[PDB]
A paper describes a structure:
While many CRL complexes interact with bipartite substrate adaptor proteins, such as the Skp1/F-Box adaptor protein complexes in CRL1, CRL3s differ by forming a complex with single-chain substrate adapters that bind directly to both the cullin and substrate. These proteins are made almost entirely of three concatenated structural domains: the BTB and BACK domains form the platform that engages the N-terminal region of [name], while the Kelch repeat domain forms a β-propeller structure for substrate binding. Notable proteins from this family include Keap1 (KLHL19), an electrophile-sensing regulator of Nrf2, KLHL9, which is associated with an autosomal distal myopathy, KLHL12, a regulator of the dopamine D4 receptor Dishevelled and CPOII coat function, KLHL20, a regulator of hypoxia-inducible factors, and [name], a regulator of hypertension with mutations identified in pseudohypoaldosteronism type II (PHAII).
The structure of human KLHL3BTB-BACK/Cul3NTD complex reveals a 2∶2 complex, with two chains of Cul3NTD bound independently to two equivalent and non-overlapping surfaces of a KLHL3BTB-BACK homodimer. The structure of the BTB domain of [name] resembles previously solved long-form BTB domains, and consists of a three-stranded β-sheet flanked by seven α-helices. The strand-exchanged interchain β-sheet involving an N-terminal “β1″ strand has been observed in many long-form BTB domain dimers, but is not present in the [name] dimer. Overall, the KLHL3BTB-BACK/Cul3NTD binding interface consists of 25 residues from [name] and 26 residues from [name], and collectively bury 1066 Å2 of surface area. The φ-x-E motif that was first identified in the SPOPBTB/Cul3NTD structure is preserved in the [name], where the large hydrophobic residue designated by φ is M83, the charged/polar “x” residue is S84, and the conserved glutamate is E85. [name] binding induces an ordering of this region between α3 and β4, including the formation of α3.1, in all three BTB/[name] complexes. Several hypertension disease mutations in [name] map to the [name]-binding region and disrupt complex formation.
Residue numbers in the entry:
A (entry chain A): 32 to 223
B (entry chain B): 26 to 331, 340 to 379
């Protein structure tokens, strides 16, 4: 019953009927129904039912989300399903987490964990750490076993930024085949 | 960075304090939520939490508590409840703009989520401050006592207060239980004993029992009208304890009133009421059974010494009428009757 209700809601949006709000990102202007957005998301719900100026605004803009992504996610809100790949996944997870669509955040997380490779690591441990997906942190560090690169340990330190200069040897778990990693790195790290 | 999160934070603080002044309309939601979002995204969530706690705490300590402190001697309840309302309304928005931290950050650090934290601050800093606390307890208890003495009281206020305590329990009755329900039960018990002595002194057993039933009903109505539903079971337990259970033998043994007098004159309705009442507490039916047993035994044994079978069959008839109509054909009563007979037929 509700499935078909959404299926026709989609049509009504695309026919631009009963649309009480326009949301704009950068390029795109998306007409939609306030109550559907409010229903599918806590962000939009708190925005439209709130006592804050946005609720009195017929038009509105959200940032830190690219246009195409926003379109894709409103389309998700209406269609209940979504497409996720390696190109979009990392612009998908933070953007969905912003609008408080959690099932999508979970999607992107699962997709990230699925593709884990000896080289992969990297952003997957960083992203999680910044995007506060904890299961992904645990999964990624439990995935750290005897990597021994100069090159992709390069990947390890490179995207973990500054706080990792702490957490590198702050982690007592590290046991290395070649003990050089403390010196050769630093000057090079200082070189760059 | 060092200075980025601070520059965001002063904005967030100004916004929160703004929300606490009820000028919130005109604040951009998207902006505030975004700022909080990025601050959490930078792993500064702890600072955001701490700042939240300090802003809220300062607001409830320096203004609201003082607001309800100056209101002690006029419209105290209305003022406190108004404060509770305003606090709730503010914490709704404060939660909404901090929503990102609320959903994600607070879980893994094991800290109270935004709204419940607000509830904790309001509880500790206002309701539990101890002038407000004592005056609140005394206010509610006094109002209830007055209503018991026949005066009219405002039940809306009481209902709101009890509800507030229930909420401050954080999905529990604990603060409502210890701050209100317990002394309420103590006071109620005292008053009930006080009335029980009066009724037992100047009345018969039947009207006393009727008055105990009526008492129970009034107290239940008080529970659903004012207090929390959960207080229904405890208070009736008190009514039953004070009026019935402490006095059981006194009730049944009343001269020209109680059980033996009802048996002699064959009052079926009164025996029904007594049975129904005493079935509520432990040892009640056993008390009735024991007094009855004694009576039936002394009478039957007095009969065995100096036709015969017609007297006995009529007695049997009588007590079977009792057992059936009054005693609800109870097993215990049957066994005690047959016990009496099997005793004095020998």
């Amino acid at each position: 019953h509700m499935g078909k209700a959404f299926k026709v809601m989609n049509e009504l949006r695309s026919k631009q009927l009963l649309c009480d709000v326009m949301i704009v990102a950068e390029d795109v202007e998306i007409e939609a129904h306030r109550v559907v957005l409010a229903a599918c998301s806590p962000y939009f719900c708190a925005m439209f039912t709130g006592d804050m100026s946005e609720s009195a605004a017929a038009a509105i803009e959200i940032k830190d989300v690219d246009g195409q992504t926003l379109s894709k996610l409103i389309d998700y809100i209406y269609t209940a399903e979504i497409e996720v790949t390696e190109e979009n996944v990392q612009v998908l997870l933070p953007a969905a987490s912003l609008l408080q669509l959690m099932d999508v955040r979970q999607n992107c997380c699962d997709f990230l964990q699925s593709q884990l490779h000896p080289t992969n690591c990297l952003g997957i441990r960083a992203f999680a750490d910044v995007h506060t997906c904890t299961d992904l942190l645990q999964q990624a560090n439990a995935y750290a076993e005897q990597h021994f690169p100069e090159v992709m340990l390069g990947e390890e330190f490179l995207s973990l930024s500054l706080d990792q200069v702490c957490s590198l040897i702050s982690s007592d778990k590290l046991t290395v085949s070649s003990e050089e990693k403390v010196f050769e790195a630093v000057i090079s790290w200082i070189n760059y | 960075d060092e200075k980025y999160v601070n520059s965001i934070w002063d904005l967030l603080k100004n916004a929160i304090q703004e929300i606490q002044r009820k000028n919130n309309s005109g604040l951009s939601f998207e902006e505030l939520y975004r700022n909080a979002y990025t601050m959490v995204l930078h792993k500064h969530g702890e600072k955001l939490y701490t700042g939240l706690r300090e802003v809220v705490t300062e607001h409830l300590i320096n203004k609201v508590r003082e607001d309800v402190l100056n209101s002690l001697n006029n419209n105290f309840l209305q003022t406190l409840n108004q404060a509770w309302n305003d606090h709730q309304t503010a914490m709704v928005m404060i939660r909404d703009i901090l929503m990102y931290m609320d959903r994600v950050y607070v879980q893994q650090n094991n800290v109270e989520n935004v709204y419940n934290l607000g509830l904790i601050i309001f509880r500790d800093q206002v309701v539990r401050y101890g002038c407000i606390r004592d005056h609140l307890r005394q206010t509610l208890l006094d109002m209830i006592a007055r209503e018991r003495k026949g005066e009219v009281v405002d039940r809306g206020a009481i209902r709101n207060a009890c509800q507030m305590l229930m909420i401050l329990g954080l999905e529990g009755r604990s603060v409502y239980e210890e701050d209100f329900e317990a002394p309420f039960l103590e006071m109620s018990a005292e008053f009930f004993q006080m009335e029980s002595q009066k009724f037992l002194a100047e009345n018969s057993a039947s009207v006393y029992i009727k008055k105990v039933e009526a008492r129970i009903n009034e107290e239940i109505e008080r529970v659903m009208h004012c207090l929390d539903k959960s207080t229904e079971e405890p208070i009736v337990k008190v009514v039953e304890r004070e009026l019935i259970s402490k006095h059981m033998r006194t009730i049944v043994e009343m001269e020209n009133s109680g059980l033996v007098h009802m048996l002699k004159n064959g009052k079926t309705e009164d025996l029904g009421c007594m049975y129904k009442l005493f079935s509520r507490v432990p040892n009640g039916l056993k008390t009735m059974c024991e007094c009855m047993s004694s009576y039936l035994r002394e009478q039957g044994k007095a009969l065995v010494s100096e036709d015969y079978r017609q007297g006995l069959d009529d007695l049997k008839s009588r007590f079977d009428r009792f057992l059936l109509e009054s005693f609800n054909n109870d097993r215990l009563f049957k066994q005690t009757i047959a016990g009496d007979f099997e005793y004095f037929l020998n």
